[PDB]
Design a protein around this ligand. Structure first.
Ligand code: HEM
Ligand SMILES: CC(=O)[C@@]1(O)CC[C@H]2[C@@H]3CCC4=CC(=O)CC[C@]4(C)[C@H]3CC[C@@]21C
Length: 462
C-alpha cells in the first residue's frame, strides 16, 4: 500500500498560535536554523544569538537587504524611506541624514522636548483622578508631539482633531499591513479575493496627503541659515545637489517612517509596561519606593535619574525582552551569495531573526517566560547588569534601530513621571489586561483600562 503523492508540506498550521513562537518550537526538532520554500522564494529562520549576530554584524552588509512585499510597497511608496527600503544609495543616504538630525538635540535639548510633553500628559491624566481610562491616546499625543517637534519644530495643541486623524490611519495601516506578523508562510492576499490592499492604500493616501501639506507650507519657512530639525536637514542636502535621491516623495516617506516608528513603538511599550505592573503589584510598590527614595517630590525626574532608578531601568529592559516590539525584527535579505553558520545562503534569500527565540532561550535565561526585572540587576540591586548576550531588542548592525536613544529616554521619563505622581491600579471591574499580545508589524497589547489616582504623597508635597 503506497503513500499519497505530496504537492506541499508546512511544519505547522497557518494562523494558529503566534508565528514567532511556532518557529521557536520547531527548533527542538530541526535545530536553531532552517529554511522554508514558497514557490520560488526561500526563507531562512534563525533562532540562535551566535547565528543572529553573524547575520546582523559579522556579515551585516551581506544580509542588509529587505524583501519586497505588496503591502510594504504601498506604505513605503515603492521601497523609499528607510525601514522597508532595500539596501542602496537612497536608504544609506536617508538613514545617515536621519541619524544626523538627532545631533541637533543633544544639549532644544531632547530631554526638554520630552519632559515638556510629559508634563502636559500628566496634567491631562490628573483630571481623570479616580476614574478608569485607556491611556493609549494621551500617550499617543505626547510622543506624537515629541516626534513632530523633532521633525518640523511644530506641536499640536489639546483638541487638535488632526491628532485623531493620525491615530485613525495609524491603526488602519497597522491593521492591513499584515494580518498577523509581517512573516506569512502562505501569501493569502494573492490567493483569494480581498479588499486588503485597497484599504491600506486609503489609509496611506490620507497619511500622504497630510504630509504633502506639511511640506508645501514648509517650503516657505525653510532657511539654510537655520538647521534645527529633520526636514531642514533633508532640504539642505537636497539643495546641495544625489538630487534624485532627495525628491519630495523620498523625503516624505522617510519622515513617514520616523513619524510611524517614533509613535507606535514607544506607545506600545508604555502600555505593555503598565500592563506588567498591573499583574505584578510587588514590583510596582518597589518602583514607588525606589523613586520616592532617589527623587522624592522636590522636582520632576530627569535623564540623570537613570543612575538612581535602577529597578525602573531594569523593568523597561525586561519588557523589551519578554515582549519585543518586533519579535522577528524586520525581515532581512541576502544581497550576495553568503553563508550562515557555514550553511550556504543564496542571494535574494529571505533571512528572519527570531528575536523571540533569543529572548526565551532556556540555556541563556532563568525562567524566561517570567516577568523578572531583577534579572537585569545584581543580587544586591546596586547596579544594572547584562545577564545574557542573547538580547537584541533594537537589533544590530546596518539595519539597527536609529531611535534607540530617543526611545529609551522617552520610556524612562514617561514611566518615572507617572509613578512619581500616579497610583496606577486595577480598574473597578477587576479585569486585568491579557499579556498574550497581538502580533502585528508591532507586537501589540489588547487595549485595557487602568484606574488612575493622584498620589497621596504627591498631594501633600504641594
Ligand atoms: C521603543 C522601542 C523600539 C524598539 C524595540 C525598536 C526596534 C527596532 C528593530 C527591531 C528594528 C529593525 C531591526 C532590523 O530590521 O534589523 C528597528 C528599525 C528601525 N527603527 Fe526602531 N525601535 C524602537 C523605537 C524606534 C524609534 C523611537 C524610532 C524613531 C525614529 C525608530 C526608528 C527606526 C527606523 C527608522 C528603523 C529602520 C532602520 C533601517 O531599516 O535601516 N525606532 N527598530
Ligand atoms: C517596530 C519597528 O522596528 C519598526 O518600528 C521600524 C519602522 C516602523 C514602521 C515605519 C512606517 C509606519 C508607519 C505608520 O504610520 C504605522 C507605523 C509604521 C508601520 C511603523 C511601525 C514600527 C516599525 C515597523
Amino acid at each position: 500500500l503506497l503513500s499519497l503523492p505530496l504537492v506541499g508540506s508546512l511544519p505547522f498550521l497557518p494562523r494558529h498560535g503566534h508565528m514567532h513562537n511556532n518557529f521557536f518550537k520547531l527548533q527542538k526538532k530541526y535545530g536553531p536554523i532552517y529554511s522554508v520554500r514558497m514557490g520560488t522564494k526561500t526563507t531562512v529562520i534563525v533562532g540562535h544569538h551566535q547565528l543572529a549576530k553573524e547575520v546582523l554584524i559579522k556579515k551585516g552588509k551581506d544580509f542588509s537587504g529587505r524583501p519586497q512585499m505588496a503591502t510594504l510597497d504601498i506604505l513605503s511608496n515603492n521601497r523609499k524611506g528607510i525601514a522597508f527600503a532595500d539596501s542602496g544609495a537612497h536608504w544609506q543616504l536617508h538613514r545617515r541624514l536621519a541619524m544626523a538630525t538627532f545631533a541637533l538635540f543633544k544639549d532644544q535639548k531632547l530631554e526638554k522636548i520630552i519632559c515638556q510633553e510629559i508634563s502636559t500628559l500628566c496634567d491631562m491624566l490628573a483630571t481623570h483622578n479616580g476614574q478608569s481610562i485607556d491611556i493609549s491616546f494621551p500617550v499617543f499625543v505626547a510622543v506624537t508631539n515629541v516626534i513632530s517637534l523633532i521633525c518640523f519644530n511644530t506641536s499640536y495643541k489639546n483638541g487638535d482633531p488632526e491628532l485623531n486623524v493620525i491615530q485613525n490611519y495609524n491603526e488602519g495601516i497597522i491593521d492591513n499591513l499584515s494580518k498577523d506578523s509581517l512573516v506569512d508562510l502562505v501569501p493569502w492576499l494573492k490567493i483569494f479575493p480581498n479588499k486588503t490592499l485597497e484599504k491600506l492604500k486609503s489609509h496611506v493616501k490620507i497619511r500622504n496627503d497630510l504630509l504633502n501639506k506639511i511640506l508645501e507650507n514648509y517650503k516657505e519657512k525653510f532657511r539654510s541659515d537655520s538647521i534645527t530639525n529633520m526636514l531642514d536637514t533633508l532640504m539642505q542636502a537636497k539643495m546641495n545637489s544625489d538630487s534624485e535621491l532627495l525628491s519630495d516623495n523620498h523625503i516624505l516617506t522617510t519622515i513617514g517612517d520616523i513619524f510611524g516608528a517614533g509613535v507606535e513603538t514607544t506607545t506600545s511599550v508604555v502600555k505593555w509596561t503598565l500592563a506588567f505592573l498591573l499583574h505584578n503589584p510587588q514590583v510596582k510598590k518597589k518602583l514607588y519606593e525606589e523613586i520616592d527614595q532617589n527623587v522624592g517630590f522636590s522636582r520632576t525626574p530627569t535623564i540623570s535619574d537613570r543612575n538612581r532608578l535602577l529597578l525602573l531601568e531594569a523593568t523597561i529592559r525586561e519588557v523589551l525582552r519578554l515582549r519585543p516590539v518586533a519579535p522577528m525584527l524586520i525581515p532581512h535579505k541576502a544581497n550576495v551569495d553568503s553563508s550562515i553558520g557555514e550553511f550556504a545562503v543564496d542571494k535574494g534569500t529571505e533571512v528572519i531573526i527570531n528575536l523571540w527565540a533569543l529572548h526565551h532561550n532556556e540555556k541563556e535565561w532563568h525562567q524566561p517566560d517570567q516577568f523578572m526585572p531583577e534579572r537585569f540587576l545584581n543580587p544586591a540591586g546596586t547596579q544594572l547588569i547584562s545577564p545574557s548576550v542573547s538580547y537584541l531588542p533594537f537589533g544590530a548592525g546596518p539595519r539597527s534601530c536609529i531611535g534607540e536613544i530617543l526611545a529609551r529616554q522617552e520610556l524612562f521619563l514617561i514611566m518615572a513621571w507617572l509613578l512619581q505622581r500616579f497610583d496606577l491600579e486595577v480598574p473597578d471591574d477587576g479585569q486585568l489586561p491579557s499579556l498574550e499580545g497581538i502580533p502585528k508589524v508591532v507586537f501589540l497589547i489588547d487595549s485595557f483600562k487602568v484606574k488612575i489616582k493622584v498620589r497621596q504623597a504627591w498631594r501633600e508635597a504641594q
